[PDB]
Design a protein around this nucleic acid. Sequence first.
RNA 1: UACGGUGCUGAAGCAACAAAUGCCCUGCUUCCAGGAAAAGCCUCUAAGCAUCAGGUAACAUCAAAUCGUACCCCAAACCG
RNA 2: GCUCGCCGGAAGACCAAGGGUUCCUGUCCAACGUUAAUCGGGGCAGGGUGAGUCGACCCCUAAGGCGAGGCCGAAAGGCGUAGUCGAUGGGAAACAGGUUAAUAUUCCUGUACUUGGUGUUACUGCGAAGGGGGGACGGAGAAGGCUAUGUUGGCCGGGCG
RNA 3: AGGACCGAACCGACUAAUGUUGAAAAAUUAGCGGAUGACUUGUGGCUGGGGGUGAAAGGCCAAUCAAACCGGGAGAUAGCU
RNA 4: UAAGGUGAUAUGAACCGUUAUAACCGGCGAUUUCCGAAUGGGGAAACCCAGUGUGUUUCGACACACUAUCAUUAACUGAAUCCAUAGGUUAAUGAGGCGAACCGGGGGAACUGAAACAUCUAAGUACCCCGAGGAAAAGAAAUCAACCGAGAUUCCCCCAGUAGCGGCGAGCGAACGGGGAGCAGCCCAGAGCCUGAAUCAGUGUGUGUGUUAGUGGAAGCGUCUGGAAAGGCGCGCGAUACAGGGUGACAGCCCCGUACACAAAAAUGCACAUGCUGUGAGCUCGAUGAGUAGGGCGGGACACGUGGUAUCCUGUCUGAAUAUGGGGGGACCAUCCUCCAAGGCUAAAUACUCCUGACUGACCGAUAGUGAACCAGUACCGUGAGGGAAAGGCGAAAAGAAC
Lengths: 77, 63, 46, 102, 93
Amino acid sequence: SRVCQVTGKRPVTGNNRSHALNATKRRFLPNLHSHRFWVESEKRFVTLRVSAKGMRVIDKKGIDTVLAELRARGEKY
Amino acid sequence: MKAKELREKSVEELNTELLNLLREQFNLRMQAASGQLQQSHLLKQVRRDVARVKTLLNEKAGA
Amino acid sequence: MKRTFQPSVLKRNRSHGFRARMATKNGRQVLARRRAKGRARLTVSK
Amino acid sequence: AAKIRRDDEVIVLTGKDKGKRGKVKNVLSSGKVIVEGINLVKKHQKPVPALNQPGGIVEKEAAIQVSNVAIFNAATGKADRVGFRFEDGKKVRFFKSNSETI
Amino acid sequence: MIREERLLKVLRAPHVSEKASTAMEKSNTIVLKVAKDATKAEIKAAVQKLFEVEVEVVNTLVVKGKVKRHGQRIGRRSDWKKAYVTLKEGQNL
RNA sequence: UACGGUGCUGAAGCAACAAAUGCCCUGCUUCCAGGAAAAGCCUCUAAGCAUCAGGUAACAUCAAAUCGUACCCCAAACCG
RNA sequence: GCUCGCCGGAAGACCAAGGGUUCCUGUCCAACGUUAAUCGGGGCAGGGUGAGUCGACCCCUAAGGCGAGGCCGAAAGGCGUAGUCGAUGGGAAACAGGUUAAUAUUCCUGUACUUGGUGUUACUGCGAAGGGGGGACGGAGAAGGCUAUGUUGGCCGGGCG
RNA sequence: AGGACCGAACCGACUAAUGUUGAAAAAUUAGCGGAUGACUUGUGGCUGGGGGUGAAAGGCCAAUCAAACCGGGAGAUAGCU
RNA sequence: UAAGGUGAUAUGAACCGUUAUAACCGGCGAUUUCCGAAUGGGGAAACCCAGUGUGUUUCGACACACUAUCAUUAACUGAAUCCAUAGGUUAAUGAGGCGAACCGGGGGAACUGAAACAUCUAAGUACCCCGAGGAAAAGAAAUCAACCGAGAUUCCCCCAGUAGCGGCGAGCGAACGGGGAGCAGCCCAGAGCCUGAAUCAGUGUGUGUGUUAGUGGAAGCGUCUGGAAAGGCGCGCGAUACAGGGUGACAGCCCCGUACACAAAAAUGCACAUGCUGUGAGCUCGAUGAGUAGGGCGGGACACGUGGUAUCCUGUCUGAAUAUGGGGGGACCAUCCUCCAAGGCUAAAUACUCCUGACUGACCGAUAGUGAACCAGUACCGUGAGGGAAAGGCGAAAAGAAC
């Protein structure tokens, strides 16, 4: 699923429109991509999929916030 | 079972009658199947009578 | 002479019989529709 | 409740014999009863004595509505009414025409 | 323990037919009914001390089918298990 | 003996040659386009354990459960 | 029953499947049978089907499926490891005399035989899920051997016009 | 030896006849076309609808196809009969 | 409840019960096969087979339980790896599956109308995926309103077919505010002072008010007609009661009933005391909501077609303030006014049904009513999803034609 693993942010329905009359569905997609992080309290590295500007939040919050989004859905690292 | 019939005529035959508990029933089952003298009440003697005590004695759990 | 069907009893149980339908979403939905119609047969595999 | 039972005489108020009386010979389910001698009708069948019976075949009285029997009064030759319960005695039939109740 | 006296749950009924009244007349062979598992693991060690007789050999067959009773719907006979038991005298090795 | 079946008795029972599609045989031979695997079995060791279990020799011994079995059959018992 | 005639690699015959009492006995003729019908591959009630060894199960596996953990996919669904199933393939023991209206490599009667367990004495390292060996598997071609079989002879039983 | 010729099994249809309320929504006869091969066949599996499969015909996909079969939308819609 | 009873087709036969376990009914229980989500493991559903542990030898493993997977609460073991941890083992609990309709999230038409047809409409409907509750949703003002005021939410009636929007066409169509049904509020952003304090549950009990196996309940006869009456005739009778079930002709008085009368072992709806134990007060000072708002680019949701498009939401870039600060007030600026987003929870007016119960039936009477009155989603048909019948009524009594 192209859904944000650290925020639950999902794709959204929406159209493409022009000067012309015929219009179509588009549906917009989240930009998440892999980055390796350090889990200092476990002396180990983990690979996580994060969006642009999303790490600028985690890098000001500490990883124990993301390890609590994961644990809220019982998911392991 | 109320205390007037509780464990009477039952525990004192729990092992010592066991060598005739199924044989005496089988003997009568084989006879009640023959239709002799047209007797059908025997099906109320080989059944509806011989589980009535030991199945009220059941309280040990397990084996 | 013949007309497009086998006497094969395995092919009559393997893919539309009880265990084969009970292993599928849409097959378990047929078990419900047979119950809604009220048939005495849950499967005609035999 | 059961108003008639096996011991009291019945007048049989139906247009079946238009006189003759009897008693209940057997009590049945679903609102029926059998009354002695009321309907001893012969059936059109062979008796098959087989030199094993002297012999013949025998009539047996057949089931009728319990609502059709009615108790006999034995005082004017008419039917009577029963009723139930009294201030003395258990589950008693009251007998609506008699000043004595058990 | 090895074998319990609970195991004497063997045999269901006698049976009566001309096959036994003719073709088992010159043998000490008898016909019996048994239930679904046919007691095949315990019947021989049980029946030798249950019916006042010593057993030579035991067998059991299944009486199957006959689903017809009426011209409208179905009335099934249902399957039943019939045992042939022969009683012993002497030895034969 | 109700012969209502159910036994008793009993002859010859061998040579000649030829002969399969079956048996030797998935043989052998031959060419090519080069042609299932595993387990039983034989055997080597790992494990584990010990006057146990196993093995070698002699001898006793408990079980063979689980399913099917009638009748049809190139056929008015299958299929149309 | 006798005779005549037809087929004879089939119009003979052995057997699984799959169907479903059709096999046995009786009485029911109402329905059935592309005709009577006294008959039954008809209706109906009852009878008959026995396994250490058969073919199957266990063991092993192809194509392929199923598939914890793991993974892709809004989702339905799919992928796939550890494992696990599976035949049209590979693996332990079976043959046939007796016969009843109808039963039988199953009972009866003989003979053959394999796998798993229990245990003693004497002496004593046994053993896998692993390793090896084997299992083991292209399609034709060409001699030889052999046997139920073929066809006479002899023998016993009968025939001799 | 044989993508040779004969030919039964098997596979397949050049002609003439029969059959299409026929025994039968593909079967029959008489002469046959092939017949160790790009063969054919028993058995199972894998592939599905705007997709499969096809020495590839709007052919085949269970009598069905310029989108099959079943159900739902559905009492479709019809300046017309 | 009941002298009856061993169910129907059912005859026949053997037995039972009436003080001492009758059958039957209502409540309270006992045991609870195999397959199925199916789950120790497998498979061609009702079959075949493991591991582990406790008891036991009578010394062939007999007897009896537990054991999918993930998550949670937590141990045992543990590789690379040192301690650790992946992996593995186990226990305890939860989830799974099925169910009528409404509901929340994801996916989502065509025909139809626009008298064509492509925006619009049909319609977020039909249908498919998932989840969940008694409702979901919504909620205790970043509400509006308009300088005057109201004061959580929702549903019904109005506002108004007006103001709006619109291939300006078909259509779509409010707000503010008014009339009702219905009105509970709380928790985190920590933790000291104070305490177990309305309220809910688990487990136990009692009372009241309903539901219930149940129990009593009036009178019509005589006679004629007829095979048979309740008709007719004669003389009546009960009237709190003439509702109608019917029963063997036109029954208030035959029975079943009606009007009315009666009662609670125990279970159970509701409301409430209360025992235990868990849960929840009172009070105060701090903390104090950020990739969040705002602004662009692309769009959604708004009656509203993007226009001047605010609001609410946002895929994506940019991006703060932090309370002389932030939001909205229909682009926007200025002033003024009023709320304070970026955490969560919740009473019932409303939506809804397979089911359960009552209440009403100028609905039907066998080519009527559902496919259905005849052991009919049964026969019957199809490979399967799926489609699906034909067929009533002798009598009071089988007395169903003996001889």
